[PDB]
Amino acid sequence: TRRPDNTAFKQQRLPAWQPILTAGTVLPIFFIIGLIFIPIGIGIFVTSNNIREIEIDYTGTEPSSPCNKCLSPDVTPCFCTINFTLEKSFEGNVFMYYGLSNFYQNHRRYVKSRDDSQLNGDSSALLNPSKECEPYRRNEDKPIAPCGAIANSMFNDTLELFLIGNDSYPIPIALKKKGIAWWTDKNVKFRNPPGGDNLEERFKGTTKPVNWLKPVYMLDSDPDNNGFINEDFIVWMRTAALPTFRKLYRLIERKSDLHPTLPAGRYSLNVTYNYPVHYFDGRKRMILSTISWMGGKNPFLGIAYIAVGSISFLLGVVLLVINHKYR
Amino acid sequence: TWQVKANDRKYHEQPHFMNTKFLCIKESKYANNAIKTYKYNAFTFIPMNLFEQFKRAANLYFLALLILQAVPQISTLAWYTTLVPLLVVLGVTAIKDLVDDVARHKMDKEINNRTCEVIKDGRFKVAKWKEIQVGDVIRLKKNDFVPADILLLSSSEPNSLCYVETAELDGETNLKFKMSLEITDQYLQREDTLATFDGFIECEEPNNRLDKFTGTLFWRNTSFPLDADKILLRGCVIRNTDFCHGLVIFAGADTKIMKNSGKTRFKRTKIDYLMNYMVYTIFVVLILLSAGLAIGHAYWEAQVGNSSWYLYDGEDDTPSYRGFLIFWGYIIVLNTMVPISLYVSVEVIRLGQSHFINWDLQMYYAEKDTPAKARTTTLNEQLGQIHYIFSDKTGTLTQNIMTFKKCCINGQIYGDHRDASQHNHNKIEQVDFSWNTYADGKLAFYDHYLIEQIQSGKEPEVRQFFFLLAVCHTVMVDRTDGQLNYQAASPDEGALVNAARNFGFAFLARTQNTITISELGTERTYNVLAILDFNSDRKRMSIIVRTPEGNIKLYCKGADTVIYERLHRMNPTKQETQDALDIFANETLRTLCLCYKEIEEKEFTEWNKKFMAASVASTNRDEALDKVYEEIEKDLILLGATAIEDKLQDGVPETISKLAKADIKIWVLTGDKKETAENIGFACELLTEDTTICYGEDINSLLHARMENQRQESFFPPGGNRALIITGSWLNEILLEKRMRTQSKRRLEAKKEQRQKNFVDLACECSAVICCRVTPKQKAMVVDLVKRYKKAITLAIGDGANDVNMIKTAHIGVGISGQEGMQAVMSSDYSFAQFRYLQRLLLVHGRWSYIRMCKFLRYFFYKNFAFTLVHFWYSFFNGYSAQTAYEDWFITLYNVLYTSLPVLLMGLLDQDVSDKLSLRFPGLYIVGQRDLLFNYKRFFVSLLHGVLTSMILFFIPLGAYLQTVGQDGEAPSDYQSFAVTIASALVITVNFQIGLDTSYWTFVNAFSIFGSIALYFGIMFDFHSAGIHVLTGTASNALRQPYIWLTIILTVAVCLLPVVAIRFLSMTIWPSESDKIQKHRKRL
Ligand SMILES: CCCCCCCC/C=C/CCCCCCCC(=O)O[C@@H](COC(=O)CCCCCCCCCCCCCCC)COP(=O)([O-])OCC[N+](C)(C)C
Ligand SMILES: CCCCCCCC(=O)OC[C@H](COP(=O)(O)O[C@@H]1[C@H](O)[C@@H](OP(=O)(O)O)[C@H](OP(=O)(O)O)[C@@H](OP(=O)(O)O)[C@H]1O)OC(=O)CCCCCCC
Ligand SMILES: *[C@@H]1O[C@H](CO)[C@@H](O[C@@H]2O[C@H](CO)[C@@H](O[C@@H]3O[C@H](CO)[C@@H](O)[C@H](O)[C@@H]3O)[C@H](O)[C@H]2NC(C)=O)[C@H](O)[C@H]1NC(C)=O
Ligand SMILES: *[C@@H]1O[C@H](CO)[C@@H](O)[C@H](O)[C@H]1NC(C)=O
Ligand SMILES: *[C@@H]1O[C@H](CO)[C@@H](O)[C@H](O)[C@H]1NC(C)=O
Ligand code: BEF
Ligand SMILES: [Mg+2]
């Protein structure tokens, strides 16, 4: 046939850059990385240590603890009182979490057990839950409104904090339950069923989950905080990545005055023990952490950055002498 | 036996000639002349293509996933969108294999429509080749190809003589004379009588024995036997004959040359076999990991799963059944270690790499307008692994052009660049031939010292020397229009006659008893008294003539060795001429010594009567003729010698040296005679003065000694230089290819296997091997021996039908295109016009194709284990429940959108060194010889690389997620954020790795690498959704936190920095051959 076209691509002569892994170009990236990762790791490690955190385990598995009575709650409403003290006052916003250990919220048979269409406020899915939430589709004759294992096994303890002052009268601590979930989840992913004004008439022809004491009608008094758009429910449904996790529970807001939000002293945790986890060696915790401008409290990254920063610098020296030897 | 009838196409359609097939097919015994080189005809495409699609291990592995995804209790997908991915991947190769086959469907058309002439009615009518049927009577003209194996019936030449060149059928460059039967000669001349010809031929069944033929013809109530001298085979071309008539005996697949073509086999690359072993290993790894994790899930469900009230699914599944049922769950989850893009990417890489061969302007032959052609798009990286090259000689290493160069007279060599009466300077203008009336410009001669000698006449022996060339030949001349065009059966005489014509000793006309040679414009008509025939054993021919004066002189020309045994005692030029021949011999030119003697009138008469007695003899006239021939030739006065060059293709000696430096062994397998094959060996520089030539006799002693020795040590000392010139007849002998019945056969195969191995051990110890007079079956037999007893990757390059068998038998087959014949090109894998383009096919295209394919495989399995093994490490943190670490929608797009393009461009554009610099350093090819880039060991290093990458990609994020990670209202501490962090680190890590693998950073390479990362980080910011709208929210949360980005940066750094150190440490302590060139690239 005829002559080939004299194109750069066709003739394999496209303009190109030929990088060579030379000693004068790779030695820097093993030193500048070392000089950047070391300060970053120190900054992370130092700032993480500056965060003041108290972790209190109230599962009561061990005896000689003031919550063991609720492991066998002959009476359904059981309460525990755990006393703790803060060495120094917490400043700024303080976040109250609850931690569950050995709780595989990431199990495949568990993560799938939800109906995203139903939680999005689909009238079709309200009375026709998907087969993904198979074991909790219908309770007796009508479908569960939040079908699935994830909604059924919702953490349902109540945690309260009290300050014990000089007068010894326990002062209650205001705790804000709003604004603890992702903004997208509140306004996009989770939405109440369409139509109506009263949640009672929206959730008709649907029953509560078998494990829940009360229906979705009154998960919270506020109309904007009940239904599928409840903060506690949404926070729970955002399944964790690992067996040990913490989920934001309440917010402690900065006081109007200049005094610390949680002044150092004597504190008591009044918890309504409802959630049983001891059968599978589960642990329940209450965590209080102070807000930090740069992330939370992550000592692992600080150590890892220093370790990688030191190895990278050490690799530069080892590679430098090897290059010099073979120069 | 075979049966044929003239002008009767219904006789061969009788019911009893239908062989019949097992499955409702007739399959007549007589094949139609239509040929077939394609694979898929109309509807055999589907079953035949899928059969060879599934020779790949992964295709059976993908099919297993389809069966596994159709089981409801383990099915994860709808099963209506897992089949379509496989069909599209299968369809991509099906279309690619169809465009390749459509190309060779068109190749058949141009050869099946060659429009010969046939008797299908009262008189001849034009008909295509495919329209030829056994028993047809056809007519051919000058330079026409023979449509099939025909029997001469007549021709315009006297005695129904016919000349055909068999360069297609063997390597011979001279014409064979074919003659018809005496009775058929005189009764089938006029066209009308051919139509009524009704002759019945009983001949042998179709065979592959080109040399001999057996049969009989019954006609006019008489029987006439037949032999191979009356049969024109399909590959022949009619020469020096205006027209001829034949009767078709065999046709199509039954033709005696088509039975020499081998069996078409499905050719697979050495890496194609390697890929199977890697898929087999991954399948075993996949089964072991899934079974190991299944046992974990069974144990996990025993104490943890059964106690977990929240993990209640209302199914009374025992932990053993749950573990069994999750084993298939992990087969599906971890299946991406071999993704469906494995062969879509390989075929996209191979298709593009094959089109660089077609597009190459350096492999484009402008003179014949013949570009290279990769006519199979499936054997590309094998061009980078060739161990042996088996080459034809005639038409492959040579141009089939033969030119007069020099000449020696009385010890003086004429032909060198000279002017006036003595050498002045090397730069000499072209000789002027206008002084001779008949001369033309074909002869490029640079010597003026010879011109003066002939014209001056001071040396009468000079004039008699060139007069010999105009008489001692035996060719006929055409004076149709006064052009004095010469038709020579042997190109040696054609060049000599043409050359001697330009020197003034022009041959004008021939007669049974006289000749009309013109000597420097002087018309002298000699008388022919006796012509001594030319034959191989004699190695010389002579002519006896009577001068116009009356003197009788014998003119002889032939091999130097035979003549020197028949020289007069008085010959002062004997020693000087011997020196001159060595100069021509050292220059690789054919030397024909010229000699003569004086014959007296009384001496001739006594010998003349004996010569007539031998001629009139009917018993052994050939032997009787040789008896008188020796008697007359006793003392010959040597006159000198000539010099003729068998013009090689330009760039052939330079190609053999470069491919030798790449450690490629080049064997010349030719159907031409030994002397021609050996002479071209020296011209190509395959043989040199250092080489000691060993023939069949020398080899036979060594091999027989080795067998007696047993009744391994190298056959030659290690430091020697040797070559083999083995004749095809000797090849059968040395290879032994010339109840108790079953018992003896095992020993018969026992020594035959041993004897073949010994020859290959001997043959491969030699620098060069030249196989001469080998049949097309023997050409493929030699390639097979190297393939079998050396496990070498073999390339076969040739032209014509005699190379089809070895072209189809070798790992890579090359056909030389651009010429009239195309038998080898149709059956070849690659096609280019000049032998010298074998440098770029191997040292540029093949070398790069091997590098680009090995870098693709190294990265492809790296980036799939790094992606997939994260599910394995996540198993220990989710109950071994087969939960995926990524979002379900990232797994689908990862192999198509995030890591697909960058490796494809690297597989199409990467270059370790320039083509100009890869030809300058042929030793770089040697890396593909030994298969160093990608072993089975290098495969596991990429698995370890991907296994450790998945360790870092999971356990650096896991350490950060076990602790506080931006715990705020917008906390990304959940599974979805955990999923987009490993995916973000994975996408950056792998796309930075290909950037480190890439050595030729074209703009498209940079665009794809950063485009792949940008596309991932554009898709997961709702940019793709915004575009669709113009035409859940996890990413906007996880990727806005400093810790999540610090985690991603740290994870990428830990993955890549150790790789850069290892690459730099290996490059600086164990630099490769390429690395040294890249460092000193500018200095070079
Ligand atoms: C800015 C510049 C940079 C641009 C770079 C981007 C270039 C993009 C151009 C891409 C064009 C393709 C070029 C060839 C790429 C290599 C071969 C290949 O990937 O084949 C693919 C064939 O795909 C399948 O088999 C089905 C894949 C899953 C179904 C959904 C896919 C389409 C989703 C619609 C949305 C996406 C639409 C995407 C297409 C438009 C490989 O499939 P796979 O993933 O291996 O299958 C999973 C493996 N498994 C079956 C074993 C489990
Ligand atoms: C510290 C890691 C030690 C690993 C074991 C020792 C090194 C090893 O076996 O390689 C692990 C793979 C290698 O992945 P690579 O892609 O870097 O594979 C090799 C590299 O290409 C070198 O150049 P080349 O010859 O291939 O052109 C080769 O040198 P050579 O063949 O001349 O010997 C070397 O052999 P070498 O080891 O130098 O002898 C190979 O490891 O992955 C990694 O690069 C790091 C992954 C680990 C990521 C960090 C883990 C914390
Ligand atoms: C808080 O949540 C826990 C679970 O995390 C709830 O315990 C569960 O309560 C349901 C009933 O509401 C139990 O289901 C069935 O209850 C009937 C009696 O109503 C009983 O006969 C059945 O055998 C079955 O248990 C469920 O088993 C139980 N779960 C566990 C692990 O014990 C609890 O009721 C919730 N409390 C509040 C105040 O929300
Ligand atoms: C915990 O504090 C409460 C109130 O301050 C007190 O009644 C109780 O005895 C304390 N228990 C322990 C173990 O300190
Ligand atoms: C703890 O909370 C419960 C529930 O409101 C309340 O009845 C009790 O008085 C509180 N104080 C305790 C348990 O000391
Ligand atoms: F063209 Be080869 F000499 F058979
Ligand atoms: Mg040839």
Tab-separated table of C-alpha atoms in Angstrom, chain B residues 509-685:
chain	number	residue	atom	x	y	z
B	509	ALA	CA	21.673	-15.381	-33.856
B	510	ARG	CA	21.943	-19.145	-33.425
B	511	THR	CA	21.565	-22.050	-35.842
B	512	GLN	CA	21.729	-25.826	-35.491
B	513	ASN	CA	25.167	-25.779	-37.170
B	514	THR	CA	26.253	-22.110	-37.195
B	515	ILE	CA	26.305	-18.990	-35.023
B	516	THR	CA	26.278	-15.285	-35.849
B	517	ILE	CA	28.587	-13.682	-33.281
B	518	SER	CA	29.844	-10.187	-34.135
B	519	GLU	CA	33.413	-9.364	-33.063
B	520	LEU	CA	33.871	-5.613	-32.538
B	521	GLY	CA	31.414	-4.960	-35.357
B	522	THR	CA	32.955	-7.638	-37.602
B	523	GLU	CA	30.405	-10.166	-38.879
B	524	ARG	CA	31.962	-13.622	-38.462
B	525	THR	CA	29.714	-16.688	-38.757
B	526	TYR	CA	31.252	-19.783	-37.166
B	527	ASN	CA	30.202	-23.409	-37.661
B	528	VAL	CA	29.040	-25.513	-34.714
B	529	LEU	CA	30.580	-28.997	-34.857
B	530	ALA	CA	29.795	-30.354	-31.376
B	531	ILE	CA	28.364	-28.921	-28.138
B	532	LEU	CA	29.465	-30.605	-24.910
B	533	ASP	CA	26.547	-30.706	-22.489
B	534	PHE	CA	26.550	-29.087	-19.050
B	535	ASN	CA	25.904	-31.249	-15.990
B	536	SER	CA	26.529	-31.104	-12.257
B	537	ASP	CA	29.119	-33.884	-12.009
B	538	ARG	CA	31.159	-32.573	-14.948
B	539	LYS	CA	31.076	-29.018	-13.516
B	540	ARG	CA	32.077	-27.679	-16.950
B	541	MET	CA	30.770	-27.474	-20.508
B	542	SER	CA	32.525	-26.937	-23.828
B	543	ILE	CA	31.802	-26.197	-27.483
B	544	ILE	CA	33.627	-27.396	-30.609
B	545	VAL	CA	33.458	-25.091	-33.636
B	546	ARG	CA	35.298	-24.594	-36.920
B	547	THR	CA	36.609	-21.118	-37.657
B	548	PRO	CA	35.711	-19.430	-40.963
B	549	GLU	CA	39.341	-19.929	-41.995
B	550	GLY	CA	39.035	-23.670	-41.343
B	551	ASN	CA	40.736	-24.186	-37.990
B	552	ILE	CA	38.945	-26.208	-35.304
B	553	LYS	CA	39.117	-24.875	-31.741
B	554	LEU	CA	37.543	-26.125	-28.512
B	555	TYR	CA	36.101	-23.463	-26.199
B	556	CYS	CA	35.441	-24.527	-22.604
B	557	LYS	CA	34.302	-22.667	-19.501
B	558	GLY	CA	33.470	-23.964	-16.045
B	559	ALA	CA	34.804	-24.622	-12.572
B	560	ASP	CA	38.468	-23.853	-11.958
B	561	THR	CA	39.201	-27.130	-10.154
B	562	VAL	CA	38.133	-29.422	-12.999
B	563	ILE	CA	39.895	-27.323	-15.649
B	564	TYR	CA	43.201	-27.265	-13.756
B	565	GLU	CA	43.288	-31.071	-14.035
B	566	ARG	CA	43.110	-30.746	-17.853
B	567	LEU	CA	45.752	-28.099	-18.602
B	568	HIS	CA	48.779	-28.326	-20.869
B	569	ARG	CA	52.170	-28.704	-19.208
B	570	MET	CA	53.178	-25.364	-20.765
B	571	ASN	CA	50.965	-22.701	-19.172
B	572	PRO	CA	52.745	-19.604	-17.790
B	573	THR	CA	49.400	-18.049	-16.799
B	574	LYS	CA	48.386	-21.058	-14.673
B	575	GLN	CA	49.979	-19.620	-11.528
B	576	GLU	CA	48.992	-16.005	-12.211
B	577	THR	CA	45.391	-16.959	-13.002
B	578	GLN	CA	45.188	-18.963	-9.769
B	579	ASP	CA	46.147	-15.814	-7.858
B	580	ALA	CA	43.505	-13.797	-9.720
B	581	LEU	CA	40.782	-16.313	-8.847
B	582	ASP	CA	41.661	-16.037	-5.156
B	583	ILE	CA	41.130	-12.273	-5.431
B	584	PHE	CA	37.680	-12.779	-6.952
B	585	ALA	CA	36.972	-15.614	-4.511
B	586	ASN	CA	37.946	-13.367	-1.599
B	587	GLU	CA	35.586	-10.770	-3.119
B	588	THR	CA	32.687	-13.291	-3.226
B	589	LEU	CA	32.240	-13.442	-6.997
B	590	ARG	CA	31.474	-16.440	-9.198
B	591	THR	CA	34.568	-17.293	-11.244
B	592	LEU	CA	34.225	-19.286	-14.472
B	593	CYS	CA	37.661	-20.250	-15.763
B	594	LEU	CA	38.057	-19.949	-19.537
B	595	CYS	CA	40.261	-22.388	-21.439
B	596	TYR	CA	40.854	-23.690	-24.951
B	597	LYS	CA	43.030	-26.091	-26.916
B	598	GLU	CA	44.101	-26.627	-30.515
B	599	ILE	CA	42.421	-29.483	-32.404
B	600	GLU	CA	43.944	-30.696	-35.663
B	601	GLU	CA	41.874	-31.791	-38.647
B	602	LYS	CA	43.043	-35.403	-38.370
B	603	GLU	CA	42.616	-35.343	-34.584
B	604	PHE	CA	38.996	-34.193	-34.856
B	605	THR	CA	38.010	-36.821	-37.434
B	606	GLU	CA	39.064	-39.775	-35.275
B	607	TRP	CA	37.258	-38.229	-32.301
B	608	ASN	CA	34.329	-37.019	-34.425
B	609	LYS	CA	33.317	-40.539	-35.463
B	610	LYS	CA	33.353	-41.698	-31.836
B	611	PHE	CA	31.257	-38.681	-30.823
B	612	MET	CA	28.626	-39.577	-33.424
B	613	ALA	CA	28.698	-43.183	-32.200
B	614	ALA	CA	27.941	-42.011	-28.659
B	615	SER	CA	25.194	-39.681	-29.898
B	616	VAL	CA	23.479	-42.329	-32.036
B	617	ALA	CA	23.704	-44.843	-29.177
B	618	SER	CA	20.376	-45.617	-27.501
B	619	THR	CA	21.480	-47.480	-24.354
B	620	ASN	CA	23.747	-45.094	-22.405
B	621	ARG	CA	24.374	-42.183	-24.777
B	622	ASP	CA	24.742	-39.885	-21.763
B	623	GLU	CA	27.535	-42.095	-20.424
B	624	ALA	CA	28.913	-42.582	-23.942
B	625	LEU	CA	28.935	-38.821	-24.521
B	626	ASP	CA	30.963	-38.269	-21.347
B	627	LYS	CA	33.436	-40.892	-22.580
B	628	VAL	CA	34.282	-38.911	-25.719
B	629	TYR	CA	34.162	-35.625	-23.786
B	630	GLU	CA	37.068	-36.693	-21.571
B	631	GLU	CA	39.155	-37.933	-24.511
B	632	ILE	CA	39.200	-34.602	-26.361
B	633	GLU	CA	39.863	-32.531	-23.212
B	634	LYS	CA	43.405	-33.500	-22.196
B	635	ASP	CA	45.592	-30.366	-22.515
B	636	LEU	CA	43.788	-27.016	-22.283
B	637	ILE	CA	45.482	-23.621	-22.560
B	638	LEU	CA	44.006	-21.534	-19.746
B	639	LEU	CA	42.832	-18.120	-20.977
B	640	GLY	CA	41.543	-16.425	-17.821
B	641	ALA	CA	38.418	-16.069	-15.723
B	642	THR	CA	35.323	-13.912	-15.308
B	643	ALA	CA	33.615	-12.423	-12.263
B	644	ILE	CA	29.867	-12.225	-11.624
B	645	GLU	CA	28.193	-10.886	-8.476
B	646	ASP	CA	25.063	-12.472	-7.014
B	647	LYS	CA	23.626	-9.170	-5.828
B	648	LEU	CA	22.518	-9.353	-2.205
B	649	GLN	CA	19.785	-7.179	-0.800
B	650	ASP	CA	21.481	-4.061	0.517
B	651	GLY	CA	21.923	-3.997	4.279
B	652	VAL	CA	22.043	-7.802	4.571
B	653	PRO	CA	25.665	-8.149	5.781
B	654	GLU	CA	25.088	-5.260	8.202
B	655	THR	CA	21.897	-6.877	9.517
B	656	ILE	CA	23.505	-10.259	10.189
B	657	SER	CA	26.298	-8.611	12.175
B	658	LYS	CA	23.894	-6.559	14.303
B	659	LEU	CA	21.616	-9.519	15.017
B	660	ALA	CA	24.735	-11.543	15.813
B	661	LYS	CA	25.638	-8.930	18.436
B	662	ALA	CA	22.157	-9.492	19.893
B	663	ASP	CA	23.113	-13.188	20.322
B	664	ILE	CA	20.724	-14.354	17.584
B	665	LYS	CA	21.835	-17.362	15.544
B	666	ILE	CA	21.098	-17.067	11.821
B	667	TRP	CA	20.705	-20.282	9.821
B	668	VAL	CA	20.215	-20.191	6.050
B	669	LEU	CA	17.751	-22.861	4.895
B	670	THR	CA	17.685	-22.802	1.094
B	671	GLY	CA	16.463	-25.064	-1.679
B	672	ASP	CA	19.296	-23.916	-3.942
B	673	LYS	CA	22.433	-25.907	-4.685
B	674	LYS	CA	25.392	-26.079	-2.313
B	675	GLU	CA	27.840	-23.947	-4.295
B	676	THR	CA	25.393	-21.051	-4.559
B	677	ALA	CA	24.391	-21.363	-0.898
B	678	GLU	CA	28.000	-21.409	0.310
B	679	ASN	CA	28.948	-18.474	-1.923
B	680	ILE	CA	26.144	-16.329	-0.506
B	681	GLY	CA	27.264	-17.332	2.983
B	682	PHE	CA	30.625	-15.662	2.416
B	683	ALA	CA	28.938	-12.649	0.809
B	684	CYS	CA	26.654	-12.212	3.830
B	685	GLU	CA	29.771	-12.521	6.072
